[PDB]
Design an enzyme around this catalytic site. Structure first.
Site, PDB file in Angstrom:
ATOM      1  N   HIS A   1      -7.640  -6.633  20.549  1.00  0.00           N
ATOM      2  CA  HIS A   1      -7.268  -7.470  19.424  1.00  0.00           C
ATOM      3  C   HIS A   1      -5.898  -8.121  19.651  1.00  0.00           C
ATOM      4  O   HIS A   1      -4.989  -7.446  20.091  1.00  0.00           O
ATOM      5  CB  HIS A   1      -7.169  -6.647  18.140  1.00  0.00           C
ATOM      6  CG  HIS A   1      -6.605  -7.430  17.013  1.00  0.00           C
ATOM      7  ND1 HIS A   1      -7.334  -8.468  16.476  1.00  0.00           N
ATOM      8  CD2 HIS A   1      -5.407  -7.407  16.379  1.00  0.00           C
ATOM      9  CE1 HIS A   1      -6.631  -9.040  15.513  1.00  0.00           C
ATOM     10  NE2 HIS A   1      -5.465  -8.441  15.417  1.00  0.00           N
ATOM     11  N   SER A   2      -5.780  -9.439  19.389  1.00  0.00           N
ATOM     12  CA  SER A   2      -4.493 -10.131  19.427  1.00  0.00           C
ATOM     13  C   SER A   2      -3.865  -9.969  20.815  1.00  0.00           C
ATOM     14  O   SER A   2      -4.515 -10.306  21.775  1.00  0.00           O
ATOM     15  CB  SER A   2      -3.592  -9.702  18.296  1.00  0.00           C
ATOM     16  OG  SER A   2      -2.630 -10.685  18.031  1.00  0.00           O
ATOM     17  N   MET A   3      -2.640  -9.469  20.936  1.00  0.00           N
ATOM     18  CA  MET A   3      -1.969  -9.295  22.212  1.00  0.00           C
ATOM     19  C   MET A   3      -2.771  -8.338  23.109  1.00  0.00           C
ATOM     20  O   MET A   3      -2.545  -8.318  24.306  1.00  0.00           O
ATOM     21  CB  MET A   3      -0.566  -8.711  21.997  1.00  0.00           C
ATOM     22  CG  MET A   3       0.230  -8.466  23.256  1.00  0.00           C
ATOM     23  SD  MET A   3       1.762  -7.597  22.808  1.00  0.00           S
ATOM     24  CE  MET A   3       1.150  -5.921  22.630  1.00  0.00           C
TER      25      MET A   3
END
Lengths: 284, 279
Positions: free
Chosen positions: B97-99
């Site tokens: 998720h995300s980074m």
């Protein structure tokens, strides 16, 4: 390989078991570790906790937003974790509780012992039938307990026991480490303190659990005694053990000594994982 | 059933996946969710963070105690989780998720053998050789993180203040990452968040190759109301992967969610992950 269900204690969350769970996973063992009601992702905070610098008067008085959480609520969540661990199809589970988590696992196991192979109390409340945890906190065996000086609310006023993990007072923060994590690295303590919450419901500590020899008492029972525990002192840990032994004579407790503070999941998670694997391999 | 490895994003921890893991577990799927280096039980904080009211000058300037963390550190950790999930009896579904998309990308390129499916949830899925800081992009204009940033530069980390005493800042933080969450859910998550995310990993290009990373069955779960990695930017990743690897196009799934569907719609998200696992 049974699946472990890991249950944390007051002001903590499932995160406290992260290192232990990883060590168990590497050793080939699955684990389910979830936040109790009112803890972790389920926590609620008094408004006074977010207004800084902390007003101790307001923070002492404010009614807790988790006051109405009950031991039954804890038991329900643990029983759900046992169900899911069992359904993964490795048979009966190994249910582990730390500190206040021992109250939750005791309640769960009496209500629904069927899916539990082994029950493990890690420096935890393992109370006699009908005796509330609060009686033990004040027992002579716990004289000296170092949590008293960290208390910031009267439970009769707040409906919770309150600490300030976000204190800016060096003395308070030193005492928190000495009481719970004396053997930990300072950086590890700071990371745990960041995840801790401030309010633990008071009512679960004042709730007797009606254990029976035939249900809770019949489960293979282990106690991991932490010899440098400053909050649930060794003499109190031993009282729990002795009471269970007298209560269920043909099924005495299996004791495992650990030269640790109250929080070996930070100071020696690898060693703790090794004890848990030993327990999983033990013959009942 | 494959085991899921769930990797979180900046300032968060494995705790963010708790509802999703539970939903997966009820449906018979195991999951391993661990803290990245510098995050969760691994976090370190500037001394500045412990003074309240906060001194913005000091907090902006203090060298980060996690400044030395590298993308390779992230990748090494993810691979240990993939290694444990693989043993615990077949190839895994790796979810970032995300980074966390930067960590799973680096980990898949370095060691793609144990991963059956790779899933990017509102996450950096960077083209070969392009560092994540490059995307931080016209597609991302309007990104709601900007006004929350509290360090330059000097710090070696991107800094936010999830423990802020300021009501307006806290309200902006919720609008940017958790607009669709109930207030009390947001507060519990914000309590667990950390302040420093290492800068260096974002500046690090991942030399992905179509034959290793590009060859894994690939899924992107787009988040249509994401205010931090904008839909236009997700879609730029998807397009760049499709071009880079004709023959193995990205499988796109859409959630009408903010950046944080693990709080807003965890069961739905778990259902999408179960569908991917059965694809």
């Amino acid at each position: 390989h049974p699946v472990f269900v890991l249950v944390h204690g007051a002001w903590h969350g499932a995160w406290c078991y992260a290192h232990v769970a990883a060590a168990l996973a590497e050793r080939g063992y699955l684990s389910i570790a979830r936040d109790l009601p009112a803890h972790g992702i389920n926590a609620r905070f008094p408004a006074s906790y977010l207004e800084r610098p902390l007003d101790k008067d307001a923070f002492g008085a404010e009614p807790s937003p988790v006051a109405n959480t009950t031991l039954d609520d804890y038991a329900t969540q643990v029983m759900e974790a046992v169900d899911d661990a069992y359904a993964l199809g490795h048979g009966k589970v190994v249910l582990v509780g730390h500190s206040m988590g021992g109250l939750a696992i005791t309640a769960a196991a009496e209500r629904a012992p069927e899916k539990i192979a082994k029950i493990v109390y890690l420096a935890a409340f393992m109370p006699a039938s009908g005796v509330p945890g609060l009686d033990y906190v004040r027992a002579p065996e716990n004289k000296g307990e170092m949590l008293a000086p960290l208390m910031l609310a009267s439970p009769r006023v707040a409906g919770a026991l309150r600490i300030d993990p976000r204190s800016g007072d060096a003395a308070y923060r030193a005492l928190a480490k000495r009481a719970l994590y004396d053997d930990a690295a300072q950086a590890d303590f700071e990371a745990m303190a960041n995840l801790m919450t401030c309010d633990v419901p008071a009512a679960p500590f004042a709730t007797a659990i009606p254990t029976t020899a035939a249900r809770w008492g019949a489960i293979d029972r282990h106690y991991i005694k932490c010899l440098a525990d400053r909050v649930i002192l060794p003499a109190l840990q031993q009282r729990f053990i002795d009471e269970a032994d007298a209560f269920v004579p043909g099924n005495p407790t299996h004791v495992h000594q650990l030269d640790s503070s109250h929080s070996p999941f930070v100071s020696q998670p690898g060693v703790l994982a090794g004890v848990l694997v030993d327990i999983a391999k033990s013959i009942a």
